[PDB]
Write a protein that binds this DNA or RNA. Structure first.
Ligand SMILES: [Zn+2]
Ligand SMILES: [Zn+2]
Lengths: 129, 81, 100, 125, 24, 216, 87, 208, 96
RNA sequence: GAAGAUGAUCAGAUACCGUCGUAGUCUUAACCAUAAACUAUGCCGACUAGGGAUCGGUUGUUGUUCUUUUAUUGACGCAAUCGGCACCUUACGAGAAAUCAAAGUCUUUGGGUUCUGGGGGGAGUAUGGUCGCAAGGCUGAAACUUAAAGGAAUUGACGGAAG
């Protein structure tokens, strides 16, 4: 059965951007999905995404523009200390100058760059580059 | 196709696509006002009615249940609401 | 390795098929695996139609045919040359050979 | 059998592809002409070479030969296949004066900015 | 040998060992 | 006495095409090796492996000897040549010919701060040939070429001096090891990095601006 | 890619597909470059002025290169009401 | 954008509709669906000739971008496109590929008919696969005349036409030649009638 | 899902699974079962002093054809009798 | 038709072939729990490519045939769908390859979870335990021995295989 609504959404994105489709439909939607997508726009990896209300869990239509390489989740959402981030970024990101490790903390869903800026830590949630 | 308008699909493909697979699910079933041949009395009947609905005024069965849409008896006219 | 994708039979969405005996040697072969041929032959050879017609007491009598459905195992059919070994690519061709 | 080999076939046909005009449909003059054009070590080989040469010319006269070009075949084919009947065979003259298109395609004409007379034909096969 | 016959050969040998242990 | 038979060969014979990056910028196929002899005179070749492969006949083995040759300029251009021939010299000589024909550009990148010239790869790249998968990870300015001797020599001729390499599979098979390593190093210009995100207009092919110089 | 002093140390800045925006490789021998001319109001092709597109070898193999040009030529005015966004 | 004279003239709408260019194969693949207008109840499929005519101008504009007409190669395996391409090669200066296509003509540089065109035009992708396949080896764009069952891989411009027609194939090559010559300026303008008749480019049987 | 549990609370299942499966590794099994201590003639040691009971020369295996010259030695520490080779040219005589 | 006996063949055949034939094959009450029990492919879930068929249900439409003369008949036909058993092409992708629409979305390594394997033998053997009337099933080693065993494909050679 469906165990991770985030993992299913990111899988549809990867299977759409390797194929070259410029859009993808995500079902179902969640605030973790919507906030994970917002981090992508701030770094430009996607265009606008459209949330469709159906009086249910929802549906999301995303616009892909091909400057993304791979986005995925890390299961489970491991506990990540501040000193742990250096290990995690090395093994997940292709280089030290680009790529993002998305963390969920009590300060919100955010990438490892601004996570180091405000010096708080939480669960690792995914990666994007 | 690489670029498609997912948010506004043409209604032509919406009419042929399954009700749960459309952008937002919507019943294709409806409600009818059935005029029996015996008398004129508004009786609201579901299209996919499972029960042999009879008129209130006259003891005449309006529809006989079928696997899908119920078939109204001869002399029964329906108007969609 | 796997010589055929269909595994030499025609069993899919099925557990068991009742076997048949080879016509040649009475060997039990699964029904969907057996080589089956429909045979509708004349009672008499085409040369024997002139002498049968003249000896007939009925004017314009039609000779009944000889109907049979033959069953073979893989060994029965190959030895009798009902089927022949095909190349690795031509094995996939399952349209009947053009003869009639 | 009397099947010519490739060394007599290709050597002969190069001669046509280079010296088409001065050859002739006669063996003996061709036999003497091939004696001066190509260096042939054996007279049997030259008689083999010249024999296929004339036979190819007999084929060139009765039609277009395959695999031989001598800068005059195709040029002569250039100005011959200009044939055009006076009626365009596409104009609306064979008909009564209007297209014979289907009834379904009639909507296609109306959809575009075209008002063309049409005899509706309903095949529905 | 053939794998099936080696399995059957051991069964005959295995039954011999069981019968011998039955004496004691 | 070299007469080019291709349009780009006539262009490179004259001063029309002077830099190999112009060839790369338009993916123009290369068929005659004399082209880059003029363009990349500084090419270093070395024989990586020589093998003898036998074909069974009705009488006996028909042995042909196979050589694998790596070519590079130590400045970001590298190629790999594998050719079989009856003799060792001809196998090496013909492999050197086809090694040149496959020279590709690589992207040197920065690990950490971008001080100085690029020295490493811009990202992790992997190439697979057969069972051999070769992964190149960028390394700091201190580490050398952390790789096996066969893979090390390939990375030297490409100008990379800082790189980690991890290999899986039957790496003792040199041919698959070098092809997989060659495939990986060619992925440097296949990974879309943020600095390459800036869109640029499409310059026309040099075969277009010089149609008359290369007609025949 | 550019270094500390700011000079563009990147040699061979590659090009990007007009359909998928993927980087076109150096040996991407299936890739093409469609060049469509400019036409003046008189109906004559303008000399040395072309509308150019870059196609990845990927999209040509999948058969979507035909649809890619039709949309690209639609957006740049080279075609009218031939490609539909709504499918 | 484009002058309004480039729209489909009623005269061409007569010629295109006359040769049954609008009939497309009964089986239509998913890629050629946008060029389909409607279905005929028999089973025949209608080509959107409005889109068809607009593809003629687009492809012809690509040919005019090629500087040397000798760099445009046309090929045809069908006899119905055998005659057309030759005078298309003659009128435009293009290079014809008559009859069978020898493999290695583009990839092998020691062959006799070794060409490196900047553009290839194909009568029918299904019957001319070898030329299309070799084009994907040396970076050559391809323009193909495609029906509704024509495969769409490694073809850039699909001009929807009836490839199984006597007069449809010749008409398209006529239309392309007319538009290609108009853009270079050989034909003075878009209103004059052309010397070349539609009957020319039409395949002729050996009977005459 | 790779067949192995991925939950954050699945550390016991992962630790148990690997612990059982290390018994398939021959080096690990000999260490924990202590086979060298129990059954090896040296008792797990490196060297061993013994008493030569006689001198015996052994045929080599195929495809080689020779006679390898060893000795039969009885061990002091554990009473076992083994065969020990004499690697060199011509010191069969030096051992008695 | 195991077993058995018999007539052949053969150097020998207590084998293949022929003739009988006992248990068994069938059934009722119980045991047994094993198969190349195979799709040699665990289950649940989402996505990725085109196409034509086919079964069940459902939804709309016929120069069709038919009840009956027609409708509310039925069959047929044309379209959609959900579910299935599958099939054909291609390989974006995977694989050592055969091949695979899953064996893809796996060094760009993480949806959830159960089970199993660590070179070939010895050996699924010994012993202990447990279940069974037994036959046996399940769990299950070690000593010692060995540099290979094996998978897919290629060339040749050979075949009491075909063309
Ligand atoms: Zn009533
Ligand atoms: Zn048999």
């Amino acid at each position: 059965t469906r165990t991770s609504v985030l993992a299913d959404a990111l899988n549809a994105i990867n299977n759409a951007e390797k194929t070259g489709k410029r859009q993808v439909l995500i079902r179902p939607s969640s605030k973790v999905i919507i906030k994970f997508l917002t981090v992508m726009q701030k770094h430009g990896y996607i265009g606008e995404f459209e949330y469709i209300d159906d009086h249910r869990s929802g549906k999301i239509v995303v616009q892909l523009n091909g400057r993304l390489n791979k986005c995925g989740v890390i299961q489970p959402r491991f506990n990540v200390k501040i000193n742990d981030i250096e290990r995690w970024t090395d093994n997940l990101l292709p280089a030290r100058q680009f790529g993002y490790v998305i963390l969920t903390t009590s300060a919100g869903i955010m990438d490892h760059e601004e996570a180091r800026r405000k010096h708080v830590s939480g669960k690792i949630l995914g990666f994007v580059y | 196709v690489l670029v498609q308008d997912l948010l506004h699909p043409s209604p032509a493909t919406e009419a042929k696509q399954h009700k749960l697979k459309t952008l937002v699910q919507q019943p294709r079933s409806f409600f009818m006002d059935v005029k029996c041949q015996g008398c004129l009395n508004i009786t609201t009947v579901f299209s996919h009615a499972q029960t042999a609905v009879t008129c209130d005024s006259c003891s005449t069965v309006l529809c006989t249940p079928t696997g899908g849409k119920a078939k109204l008896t001869e002399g029964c006219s329906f108007r969609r609401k | 390795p796997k010589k055929r994708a269909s595994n030499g039979r025609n069993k899919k969405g099925r557990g068991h098929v009742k076997p048949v005996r080879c016509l040649n040697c009475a060997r039990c072969v699964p029904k969907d695996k057996a080589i089956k041929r429909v045979t509708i032959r004349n009672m008499v050879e085409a040369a024997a139609v002139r002498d049968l017609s003249e000896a007939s007491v009925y004017a314009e009598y039609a000779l009944p045919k000889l109907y049979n459905k033959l069953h073979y195992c893989v060994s029965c059919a190959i030895h009798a040359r009902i089927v022949r070994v095909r190349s690795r690519t031509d094995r996939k061709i399952r349209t009947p050979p053009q003869r009639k | 059998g009397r099947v010519r080999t490739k060394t007599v076939k290709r050597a002969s046909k190069v001669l046509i592809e280079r010296f088409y005009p001065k050859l002739t449909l006669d063996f003996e003059t061709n036999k003497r002409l091939t004696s001066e054009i190509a260096v042939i070590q054996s007279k049997r080989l030259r008689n083999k070479i010249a024999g296929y040469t004339t036979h190819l010319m007999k084929r060139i006269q009765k039609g277009p030969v395959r695999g031989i070009s001598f800068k005059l075949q195709e040029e002569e084919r250039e100005r011959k296949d200009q044939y055009v009947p006076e009626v365009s065979a596409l104009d609306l003259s064979h008909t009564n004066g209007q297209l014979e298109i289907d009834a379904d395609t009639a909507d296609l004409v109306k959809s575009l900015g075209f008002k063309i007379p049409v005899q509706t034909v309903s095949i529905s096969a | 040998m053939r794998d099936k016959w080696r399995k059957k050969r051991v069964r005959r040998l295995k039954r011999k060992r069981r019968k011998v242990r039955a004496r004691s | 006495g070299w007469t080019p038979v291709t349009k780009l060969g006539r262009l490179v014979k004259a001063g029309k095409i002077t830099s190999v990056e112009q060839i790369y910028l338009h993916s123009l196929p290369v068929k005659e090796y004399q082209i880059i002899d003029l363009l990349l005179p500084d090419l270093k070749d070395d024989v990586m492996k020589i093998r003898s492969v036998q074909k069974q006949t009705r009488a006996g083995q028909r042995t042909r000897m196979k050589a694998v040759v790596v070519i590079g300029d130590s400045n970001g251009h590298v190629g790999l040549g594998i050719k079989t021939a009856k003799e060792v010299a001809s196998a090496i000589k013909a492999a050197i010919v086809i090694a040149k024909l496959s020279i590709i550009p690589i992207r040197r990148g920065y690990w950490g701060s971008n001080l100085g010239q690029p020295h490493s790869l811009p990202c992790k790249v992997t190439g697979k040939c057969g069972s051999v998968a070769v992964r190149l990870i960028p390394a700091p300015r201190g580490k050398g070429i952390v790789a096996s001797p066969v893979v090390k020599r390939l990375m030297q001729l490409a100008g990379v001096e800082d790189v980690y390499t991890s290999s899986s599979g039957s790496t003792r098979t040199t041919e698959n090891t070098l092809k997989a390593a060659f495939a990986a190093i060619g992925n440097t210009y296949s990974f879309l990095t943020p600095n390459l995100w800036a869109e640029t207009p499409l310059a026309a092919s040099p075969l277009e601006v010089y149609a008359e110089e290369a007609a025949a | 890619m550019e270094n500390d002093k700011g000079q563009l140390v990147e040699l061979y800045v590659p090009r990007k597909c007009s359909a998928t925006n993927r980087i076109i490789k150096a040996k991407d021998h299936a890739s093409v470059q469609i060049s469509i001319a400019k036409v003046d109001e008189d109906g004559r092709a303008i000399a040395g002025e072309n509308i150019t597109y870059a196609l990845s070898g990927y999209v040509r193999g999948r058969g979507e290169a035909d649809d890619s040009l039709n949309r690209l030529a639609q957006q740049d005015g080279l075609l009218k009401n031939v490609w539909s966004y709504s499918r | 954008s484009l002058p309004a004279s480039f729209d489909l003239t009623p005269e061409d709408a007569k010629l295109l509709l006359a040769a049954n260019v609008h009939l497309g194969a009964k089986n239509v693949q998913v890629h050629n669906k946008p060029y389909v207008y409607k279905t005929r109840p028999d089973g025949m499929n209608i080509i959107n000739i409005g889109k068809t005519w607009e593809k003629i101008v687009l492809a012809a504009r690509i040919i005019a971008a090629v500087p040397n007409a000798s760099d445009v190669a046309v090929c045809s395996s069908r006899t119905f496109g055998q005659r057309a391409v030759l005078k298309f090669a003659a009128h435009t200066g293009a290079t014809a590929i008559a009859g069978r296509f020898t493999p290695g003509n583009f990839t092998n540089y020691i062959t006799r008919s070794f060409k490196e065109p900047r553009l290839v035009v194909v009568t029918d992708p299904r019957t001319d696969a070898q030329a299309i396949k070799e084009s994907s080896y040396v970076n050559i764009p391809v323009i193909a005349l495609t029906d509704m069952d024509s495969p769409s891989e490694y073809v850039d411009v699909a001009i929807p036409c009836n490839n199984k027609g006597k007069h449809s194939i010749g008409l398209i090559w006529w239309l392309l030649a007319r538009e290609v010559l108009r853009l270079r300026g050989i034909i003075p303008d878009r209103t004059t009638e052309w010397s070349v008749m539609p009957d020319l480019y039409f395949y002729r049987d050996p009977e005459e | 899902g790779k067949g192995k549990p991925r939950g954050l609370n699945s550390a016991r299942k992962l630790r148990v699974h690997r612990r059982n499966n290390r018994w398939a590794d021959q080096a690990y099994k000999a260490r924990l079962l202590g086979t060298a201590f129990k059954s090896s003639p040296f008792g797990g040691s490196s060297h061993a002093k013994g008493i030569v009971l006689e001198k015996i020369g052994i045929e080599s295996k195929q495809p080689n054809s020779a006679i390898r010259k060893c000795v039969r030695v009885q061990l002091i520490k554990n009473g076992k009798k083994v065969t020990a080779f004499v690697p060199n040219d011509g010191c069969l005589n030096f051992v008695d």
